[PDB]
Design a protein around this ligand. Structure first.
Ligand SMILES: Nc1ncnc2c1ncn2[C@@H]1O[C@H](COP(=O)(O)OP(=O)(O)O)[C@@H](O)[C@H]1O
Ligand code: NA
Lengths: 15, 292
């Protein structure tokens, strides 16, 4: 299961 | 609570990727501000880096002013200009429909914000309705860009040498608005910020994108379904029923080479020509100004 907010949450960092 | 010398902390107004945003007062000036707090003890400190990027951006139209940076008790502190609602907030207040005139008013400013950021050697990498805020008061007609949490240099400040091409990258940014290159694991460049804006603009036109609400068992599977849907949706199908400029804009962004300097001025002129053919005036009367 993945929450539907997976498509709109910011992912990663400056790296 | 007393922050710096002259700032009073009020209630929380926001939470992004890290820290929290509070209403504040500049007690000395008599002006409301936003105060970002980050716990000094955090695992991955980011506020100091973000404040460095905001300081390099200072002088730009629609870049929030930084008023103060420092550390106070258990917190790193960045005091900024208080901004208004996000474009996502305003989209909800307008029943998730923007008039063509509002979308074109916004496109003009948003292309300019992204250009300005690129001129300071950074890519934003998180272009989405949540990260553009309208100003307040005399700044009520200005679109601001925020959230430099994923921002990074795409070129040396001195040489303007572009970062190298790289593949097999994790998704960075927001899946819904991510460029096809980002989905394919390609290093982000100037083109990817503009491609993302292209999807934001069609999101405003449509009320949703055809790759929203895809069922999957995993984040990575969700991202891949989004990727597959984007790659299998022709730009002319995405943009069907809307002025051709939206399709021309997305075709131009998808044609850019990794290290190409976008023709920002061409992309603005596309929308500006359409604005004129519609007989709209640049009076900054947005849909949400009509709310009674
Ligand atoms: N200067 C500001 N004025 C008003 N609200 C803000 C401001 N900065 C951020 N916010 C709100 O807080 C949320 C979190 O912001 P964040 O992504 O941490 O951006 P930043 O680090 O640029 O302030 C935003 O979505 C927005 O709703
Ligand atoms: Na206005």
């Amino acid at each position: 299961y993945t929450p539907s907010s997976a498509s709109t949450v910011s992912v990663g960092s400056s790296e | 609570l007393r922050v710096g010398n002259r700032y009073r902390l009020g209630r929380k107004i926001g939470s992004g990727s890290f820290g929290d945003i509070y209403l504040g007062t500049d007690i000395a000036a008599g002006e409301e501000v936003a105060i970002k707090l980050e716990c000094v003890k955090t695992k991955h400190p980011q506020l100091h880096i973000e404040s460095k990027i905001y300081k390099m951006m200072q002088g730009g139209v629609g870049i929030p002013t930084i008023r103060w940076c420092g550390a106070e008790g258990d917190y790193n502190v960045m005091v900024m200009e208080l901004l208004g609602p996000s474009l996502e907030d305003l989209f909800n207040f307008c029943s998730r429909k923007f008039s063509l005139k509002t979308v074109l008013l916004l496109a003009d400013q948003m292309i300019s914000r992204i250009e300005y950021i690129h001129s300071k050697n950074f890519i934003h990498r998180d272009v989405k309705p949540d990260n553009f805020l309208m100003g307040l008061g005399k700044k009520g007609n200005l679109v601001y860009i925020i959230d430099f949490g994923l921002a990074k240099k795409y070129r040396d400040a001195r040489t303007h040498q572009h970062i190298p091409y790289r593949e097999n990258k994790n998704l960075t940014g927001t899946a819904r608005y991510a460029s096809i290159n980002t989905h394919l694991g390609i290093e982000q460049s100037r083109r990817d910020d503009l491609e993302s804006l292209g999807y934001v603009l069609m999101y405003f036109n449509l009320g949703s994108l055809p790759w929203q609400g895809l069922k999957a068992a995993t984040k990575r599977q969700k991202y891949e379904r989004i990727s597959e849907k984007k790659m299998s949706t022709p730009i002319e199908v995405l943009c069907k029923g809307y002025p051709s400029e939206f399709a021309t804009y997305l075709n131009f962004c998808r044609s850019l080479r990794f290290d190409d300097k976008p023709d920002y001025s061409y992309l603005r002129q596309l929308f500006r020509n359409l604005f004129h053919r519609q007989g709209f005036s640049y009076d900054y009367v947005f849909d949400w100004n009509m709310l009674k």
